[model samples]
Target chain A: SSMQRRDALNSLTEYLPKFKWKESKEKILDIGCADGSVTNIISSCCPTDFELFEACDVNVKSVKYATEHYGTSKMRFRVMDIESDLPKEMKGKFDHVFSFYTLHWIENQEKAFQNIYDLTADDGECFLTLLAQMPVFNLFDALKHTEKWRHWLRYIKNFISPYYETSDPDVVIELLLKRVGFRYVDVRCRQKKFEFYDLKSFRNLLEAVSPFKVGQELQEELIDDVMEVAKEMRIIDTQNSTAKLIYNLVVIHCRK
Target chain B: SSMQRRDALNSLTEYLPKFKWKESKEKILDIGCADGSVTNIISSCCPDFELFEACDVNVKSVKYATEHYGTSKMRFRVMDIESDLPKEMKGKFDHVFSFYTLHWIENQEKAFQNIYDLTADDGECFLTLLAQMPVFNLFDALKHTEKWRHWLRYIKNFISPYYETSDPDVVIELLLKRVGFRYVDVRCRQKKFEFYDLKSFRNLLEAVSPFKVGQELQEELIDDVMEVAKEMRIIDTQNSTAKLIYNLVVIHCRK
Candidate 1:
């Protein structure tokens, strides 16, 4: 659950020190604050004297929970969908826009990039961590075509990353930021790997975030099939007693 | 399971229109908003477009309800009204509401005083709470009994002082007078509710019981209480339908 926090800490620790800050009180924004756990982590790891650090998400319940648990005098949680119509009150208001491990789920990549550009204020900065390719994405692609799971996962394309099929996606995505009028855009795609140390945690991960609906009776059977597909496709290592997640990350730091 | 929530909404919908509300957006506070289902019900029934705030002492319940029922127009937190009030909420509410909440409070005066402090000038207060019921007798009986004494010891705290009072409305009206409300209307009376199935009634009792009994033992305790209630003749079970007669107090007033 806290795997997302390691990346935000690792990325922000390096960039925030050299990051430029404006003279006056700067307003900050965080996108895709699903539960506010990592949102708080991002806020704490940053080095800035911010006037307000606002976290926003599309889920109403998570936003409210975040507001109750994490919000303070200078920190606020709001309900916002970054891919849709931006709020009139928020246009060009953020001095620092930070989105961590969120854009991979978005459908319209170009629209998301343009929305980020529009949210940037004068000389404001933006940071992003997006998944480029992952074995789990491939596993989902393979599972949807199988005879048994196809009935349930026929629409699995909706859950797969848009960059799953592209070659050298980081370079193209860097050009995308430039096309959207971002200044000094840097899209560094790095290869990273993770291990689900034990079998139970791996199954819990699938049970918690599976893309399809299931009943109590068929839940374990679905996980059984998922595990078989994983080992059959060499997605998980049985001898090691672990599941390996090989992924590529596109980390972007830019200015408006 | 839902009938209790429905009762609060049914009663509030009748009185909210007649409430004198000031112009512009108003702020509302809902006490004991467990799971926020009825809090939303109260909001949808009201005429004013106010920003609703709700609080419950249970942290888990507040988080679960906020996840399922929260919107930009409404928010929730965890706070105890009996002992401490939210510091920032003094005199901030244009409307205050509580449903099935006051009976669970042990310190009636402090709760009412906290409610009064939260109310703004010209603010309105609406409440519905249990005054007397066969269930209260059931709780008292089990608490004094031998085998159930351990877990049921604290059940008396959940029962209000108005539970056995002969003049329940007069008692509440007197307290509201002390709180300095300019207008007070307190109505108390017996209301009969029938359960078509006894099993559902048992489940209802299990869910609303204040004692922190475990799942396995709570089931046994609920059955035992039902038998005792039937033996005491407080609950009339005829033709397989259970009838429960109880007293309720409805209080509406202005600060």
Candidate 2:
């Protein structure tokens, strides 16, 4: 529990300043606020600034934990999905909104864009940052077509939800924002290289955060075959002392 | 001259629109156009379709380019990229170019967005700038030395933040793509500059040095830096000449 919160807070420090509110009394919302630890990080930056800070996540367990631990007089946490409609009270309430390391998991990107557009106040801005592309996807696509893995993948695909949609391309993100009535939009894609000291930490990080839903036995079986395929594909480099993961992420900033 | 122009134009093809250009006439702008030679390379690509506009901060150079090369298709003007662009030029150009110029501008993020703003929808831009140099490594090494701590801090603090060279691969890539350029690509290559004599090497050092040593102590500081560099053996001396390597980055993006 402590480890997860620490990692979330560390990542928040990377892109938190972009959504910082200069004036007091502004209502801010954090979408896909896993466990609300990142919301705490934001409040820690400015304790007395925001009038109200609300956070939403699709995971009920995550919301329960966040509400119990991080909720305060100025803060609230709820379970909500961006692919669906926002709660009536939350509509047009936020002065500034932000989401980090989320949105890629949801398939209905257009609907998510519309919800984000509708959630913001008349004079509000939204910042959404998420993974644009992951190397793991490439490996899976290769395995899905390969003769050896194709049979196993047919079974694993259903358990693994291989048909799930991830992030959108940069052009699609821009067009979606404009289509949702955002007047000014800024989208940046950054390729980040992250190194893990050992394979165990790499495994732990991936397993903890991976969106795949499968039984432990199935996962253990899949992980071994996935690593083998990943090695053959050259997407995961384990020969070196440190394991390196390279991926691209996009940050979108827009206003009505 | 034709060979040089031909080579420059050939390089543009690697990143230019291999896809069809819909409009017959495409408006093009070249920022930081010095002497208009680089602009001419693009014009030489498709002279009939490219309506070229070139701008530079140096008025004398701008005047020279206008007098020598300006035509109905290509024109030259005095424009400072770090400042507000001409109102008429905003969101106007179908293609843009800035070569070895962005490093000179201090507020790179703002300058990059401005470059993005000047381009028409579906337009593309190409930029080349010095990415890294040996001088930065020398200064970083000097910072760790016992004798240069205070001096290095003073230099670091006083130097213009905008003028300080940065890793182009990171900053430019992030800024260009983040500023809403639809398609972006960045590449880097190292270029070496050879100095025939110590005097020429020292002059080159002084010319590009970010630190502004006081006049009274200018020679003394340069001598100290040279001594440190010699002891470190970073410079290659052969046939009484020195050689230094610089890394440059080229970024191409389409809207």
Task: Assess each prediction's global lDDT (C-alpha) against the native.
Answer: 0.77, 0.65
Q: After superposition, how far is residue B196 of candidate 1 from its true place, in Å?
A: 1.0
- The DockQ-derived docking category for candidate 2 is incorrect
Which regions of candidate 1 deviate over 4 angstroms?
A: A1-256, B234-238
Chain B of candidate 1 versus the native chain B: what TM-score?
0.94
TM-score of chain B alone in model 2? 0.68
Q: Report the poorest 10 consecutive residues by lDDT, candidate 2 chain A.
A: A159-168
Kindly give the stretch of ten consecutive residues in candidate 1 chain B with the minimal lDDT sum.
B231-240
Model 2 RMSD in Å is 15.2
- Looking at model 2, the pairs that clash are A188-B178
Per-residue CA lDDT of model 2 for A103-142, tens digit only, reads 7666687888899999998878887777544445544444
Estimate, for each residue in A140-227, the C-alpha lDDT of model 1 and write its tens digit: 5556656777788877877776775564465578889999999778776544445688878878777765757767787788788877
For model 2 chain B, give the 10-residue run with minimal summed lDDT. B158-167
Tell me the TM-score of each prediction against the true structure. 0.49, 0.51
